[PDB]
């Protein structure tokens, strides 16, 4: 458990804490270039125009190529989705299989005092592998949650990895007010090369979590291999090895492992 | 219980957390286009005019077709209604039937130790199906709350689903100050093509919860089918199967399910 | 109890939560129309003038008919009164009759173990209806609190129901500064058709709680009818039926209702 | 106790909650009328001048009659005094006489089990009225705190009641800057009919608590009459009746009042 | 104890709560009179000039007489000192003599059960006055903390009492920028009759705590007199009377004072 | 302990509470004098220029003598250092020697009940001075933390004490924009006698803590003298006297000090 | 443990508290020099331009040498990384080896009462060094976390140490709007010597933590030397010495170390 929950707790809580660091350095959200002192107010109107006129205009105003890419408005918004999706395979196990393993935790904790009174009787335990001999496909339904997470992190690396090639010239563009021209056709200049503010801290934020999660993806692959190096294949590890390790989950007893020092001599 | 409460808790708390994400990115609420520097103040007066002059003007100022559709002013407001309505069939069961099942939880917990002392006596339980033989229509009054929720999510999909076809050109419109013209008929220009700000993040917010709740609607249909695949029809499942599963609600005992491993050998 | 407290707790806490939703969307409170750039400050003075000059001017400045109707300045203020008045008949019972029924809760809880040791003796309860034979008019003083609430909700429906007919043209009006003219009679124009901002969200807020409380008024009428369908009239229900149901208030015992399954066989 | 503490707790906590409702609708505090765009700043200087020049100017600038009435600057400030003064006769009793009655609570709780073992002995209490036969003037020192509160609420009704006759024309007045004229005698106009903002919500706030406390003043008069209707006059009620009722303060016992149902038969 | 701690707790916590009431009504801190629209900014510079140029200018700019009286900049600041200084003689006793009296509390609590088993033996206490016969000058070191507080409140009445005679014309004055003239000697006018804002609420705040603490000063004098009216002079009250009253500090026993009712008969 | 922790807790928590009082009265941070209405913005640029151009300019712009004294920008910043440095010799003892004295607290608490059962046996303790006969230089490592604190407070008095002589004319100075002149050499005037705002409340803040800590420095000298007046020199006080006083640290027993009253007679 | 956790807790919590001190003195973030009153708004546009145009412009606009050094935008951002990286080797041990040493804490706590009943038997312990005779390479996996931290602090000293040589002239630079010139080539001047604000408090902040962590780096070197001065080399200290010291971790017993005083005599 605790080899997994080091990842499963600290790493999703890393990214929202990283997401909170963006919120301190917001300041404003976008600026525009007014045409030389026509008001304080209509300049604010033109600035608020194009920031909402990003995605509805299906026409080509950015001349960038694949320019309706929605212009990364959602880096807190998408990271909010990816954080809570990683939170589920812990909580899915926690409310559907962690009580069933807590029964198994109780089931092994009466198995250990059975060895304890056997040593007191030394002054039936061999059946318990036959109690755990069957198929029990519900454990395989538990083990897929680690495989389920691996899909999420992989496309996350594709999602962040597309941004760096996207980060060449995706800040400066042309906007206009076409229907507001259509009401008068008189006074307002058409184009205003406005400029977004987000890429200066976001592009250098997308370096970190990608190269972190790249350096953490083989660890989950390693997590599905400790059952492989312990004498049974993954179709036959069904109950034995995921009970051998979770023997060391809550605690131990006074003669759980001090027997071996007695056994050494 | 816990197969339902995974939906019943996390999914309504999803949408208010989604509703809180809107409140960070409010900024302003609407902008307008002043007629070229007449004041700082009267421009603010004209902007605050039309934002309240949306629904009272029964005349056709938007030339959009069915234009008094109230212009989606209420996406936090309607989602506040739908979140708390889903909260009720948990709380309706929790304050009217969860203590009655807690008595039944006590009633089955004395049934299980009766099997326990029977094994101690091995060193009357057969009557309990006849204790649960009657009609008990109050359980059917409990089971309709899942059916009650299904009505709410269905029209929610109609409510959000109408918005995407609504999202074609429902942002730009014409407004005026007619009675303020009627006081002088002298100076103020009539029409001002103002522009709302909400659709840029709301239309791309209404994608998510609809396609989530579409991918969750057959799960509640599946919830009313585990009584069907367990040897009695829905008119005859009255007490047996909703007590068989809630046997695994709070906890188990040391020989609740370890009997089967003893029974296997 | 719990059939009533579902209404008595959630419904007054509904309306203050609805009242809190108004406070997020305040923004400003009123705007006015200045006469074309005379200052930033004197325009703010004229705007703050008429917002306080609403009710003191007993003259007819609105030409609306019954125009000193105080112009609904108090929708958070009146709802604050109606919320706390519904809070009293719970708390009036809670600090004056709930300990007396808690003594009766203790009085019936020693009556139930008297039946329990009678079953142990099977290996005087018939007197208790004669202990509850008298008039006990203090219970009728308890039961009027439900009738007391019904008066409050009825006139609340009249209060909110008057607003929709009031909502025709009760936003736009004429104001002036008459004594400020009287100091100089020189420069200031008289009338300024200012405009309030509140009706755009308040009129569509008064739809909800009215149609909710209309759909909840017969439930309290139903609450005074469960004593009617249980073999005694309301002058004779005095103690028996309001003790029969509150037997199921705190909890039950192991043979409170499992006797019936023993009695069935 | 609990007949009094329903008033003694909820009613002072009512008025500070009413005082908190003022703080949300502050906005600004006073406005003034500048003489037509001389600065943004000196207009703010003249506005801040007269708001502090209210009470120091002993001359007649308001021409209202008794015009140094300090102009109700202190409605949160005075209500802060009246709220905490009502809080004292609870707390004065709570830290000086409530432990002494808690000893008496212990003293009567050993008197009740003395009746309990007497019924066990049925398978000396008559002395306790002679234990409570003396004068005990300290109880009369307790009972004056209710009389002490009645003085406070009475003059509070005079304080709020003077405001409605005061509310005729106590908002508009004349102010000037006399010494600032005395430095130059050149440029500044003298009088500026400024206008306060507070009376629009305060005068319609002073309706409520006055008519509430008028409808609560005879209740405290009724509180000093339950000792009168129970066979001894107020000079002779000294200990008996204020111990008869506080017998029902904390709790009761299993045969405190179930004796009467045994006594009925 | 509790006759003192009613003063010692509530009265210092009164004044910081009074000090918090100032912080809500701050708004701004000082205003000045600009010379008729030279900038928004340099007017703010001149206003911030003189507010720091109050005390460093040892010259006579106020022409008031004793004009470097520092102009009461410190009414939250000085009240912060006087509040925490009153907090010390509680806390000085609490961390140096309250455990020693808690040992004495334990010492008298074994003296009371010695009387209790003596009544059980009725089915050596006379020595305890001789255990408390000595000088014990450490108790006189405790009793001076009440005398220590009396010095603080007395000069506090002098401190606040000097302010009312100070409050005649200590708000309006003359300021200038002399070295800023010395850089150019060209453009800036010299004098600007600025005006402070603090005296309008502070002078009418200094009425209250003075007349409160005047009406509380003889109570502490009364506190050093209950040892005088109980048969020993203040040089001889050393241990007996400050243990007689603190017998009633924590609690009593079942026969601590019910002995007297047994002794009455 | 408690004679020290009265200083060690309340006095560092005094200064941060004093540091918090500065943060309420910040307002702005510095002002400057613009050259007569060139913009709102470039005036803000010149003001923000020199506030960062304080310490980097190694040239002589202040003509004050030792003018790169960094101009007391750090009075919250330095006081933050001095507060947390005083917090360490408590916490250094608390996590390295307070458990070792808690073992000694346990070690003396079994020594006291050994005297208690000796009195029960009256119906070996003399060895314990020989248990505490050795050198135990770790106690001298504890006692230097009081000496360690004394160094910090002494230079703190030098640090604050240098400020008053510094407070003569260290607010007004000359600044310029030299490289901004170097880009054009055309328009901008060179010098602007700006003015800081901090000394008006800081110089009269540095009076207090200095004269407080001067009046507390001999108390720590007195703290290292109670071992001197109790029959052994500071090289020989090693364990006896710092265990004699901490006998009275947690509590006492029923016959810890009541033996002396038995011993008196 | 506690010799390490004095560093491991207080020193990372030092730097975030130091990081919080920056956030109070933010104010603004950057200023620029407008070209002499062209608007309020376009000046704000040019200022927001270059603050985002820092790192994307790969051209040489600063003429400083290695000028794309990203200009220390990340001093809260980088310190956030270094603080949480130091937090891991505590938490890595805490969730993977602290329960295993808590089992060893239980394992030694039954070893100590074995000595206790041996003294009771005086009215097998010698085997326990042979229970701790093996290799146990997992302890060496624990001890590398101190070595892991030392790498982080070393390059932190390189990171902060590069800043002081960087702090010569890394604040003033040249910026322009090249594509905004490219749209018109008409009106806007090219270069504007803007100026950052951060180095005035940051360069004098980077003094402290570097010279602190330099004065703490040999302490961790000393931490890996207490196993060296206790009779076994670091390849042979495997279990004995890291159990000898953590014997004094939680507590001791009444005869854990009082045996030595018995052993002295």
């Amino acid at each position: 458990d605790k080899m997994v929950t080091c990842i499963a707790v600290g790493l999703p809580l890393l990214l929202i804490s990283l997401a909170f660091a963006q919120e301190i350095s917001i300041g404003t959200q976008i600026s525009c270039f007014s045409p030389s002192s026509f008001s304080w107010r209509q300049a604010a109107f033109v600035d608020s125009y194009c920031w909402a006129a990003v995605q509805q205009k299906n026409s080509l105003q950015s001349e960038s190529g694949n320019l309706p890419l929605w212009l990364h408005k959602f880096f807190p918004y998408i990271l909010l989705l990816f954080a809570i999706l990683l939170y589920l395979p812990p909580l899915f196990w926690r409310f559907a299989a962690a009580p069933h393993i807590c029964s198994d935790l109780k089931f092994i904790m009466e198995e250990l005092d059975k060895v304890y009174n056997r040593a007191i009787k030394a002054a039936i335990v061999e059946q318990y592998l036959k109690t755990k001999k069957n198929s029990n496909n519900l454990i395989i339904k538990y083990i897929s949650c680690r495989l389920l997470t691996l899909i999420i992190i992989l496309l996350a690396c594709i999602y962040l990895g597309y941004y760096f090639s996207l980060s060449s010239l995706s800040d400066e563009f042309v906007c206009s007010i076409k229907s507001g021209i259509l009401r008068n056709d008189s006074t307002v200049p058409d184009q205003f090369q406005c400029k977004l503010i987000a890429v200066g801290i976001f592009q250098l934020l997308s370096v970190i979590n990608l190269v972190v999660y790249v350096l953490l993806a083989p660890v989950v692959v390693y997590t599905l291999f400790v059952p492989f190096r312990q004498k049974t294949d993954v179709l036959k590890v069904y109950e034995i090895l995921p009970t051998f390790d979770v023997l060391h989950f809550k605690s131990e007893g006074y003669n759980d492992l001090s027997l071996y020092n007695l056994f050494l001599e």
Side-chain angles (χ1 to χ4, degrees), chain A residues 185-236:
Chain A
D185 309 296
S186 179
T187 49
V188 190
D190 319 329
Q191 52 265 7
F192 300 103
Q193 295 179 349
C194 301
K195 167 173 179 181
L196 193 59
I197 202 167
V199 306
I201 74 176
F202 280 174
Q203 185 200 349
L204 269 300
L205 180 138
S206 36
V207 197
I208 292 190
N209 178 41
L210 178 131
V211 79
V212 161
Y213 280 174
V214 163
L215 281 183
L216 190 141
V219 180
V220 187
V221 187
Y222 173 69
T223 311
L224 310 181
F225 278 157
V226 196
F228 166 71
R229 278 87 45 83
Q230 275 184 356
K231 296 290 185 181
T232 54
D233 209 353
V234 285
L235 211 64
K236 273 80 56 187

Side-chain angles (χ1 to χ4, degrees), chain A residues 17-53:
Chain A
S17 76
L18 176 132
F20 284 165
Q22 294 155 329
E23 285 304 311
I24 308 300
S25 169
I26 295 301
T28 62
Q29 302 95 340
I30 193 180
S31 81
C32 272
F33 175 67
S34 73
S36 312
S37 283
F38 289 161
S39 174
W40 180 90
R41 185 54 100 177
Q42 62 92 46
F45 160 72
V46 171
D47 173 83
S48 168
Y49 188 94
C50 302
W51 195 84

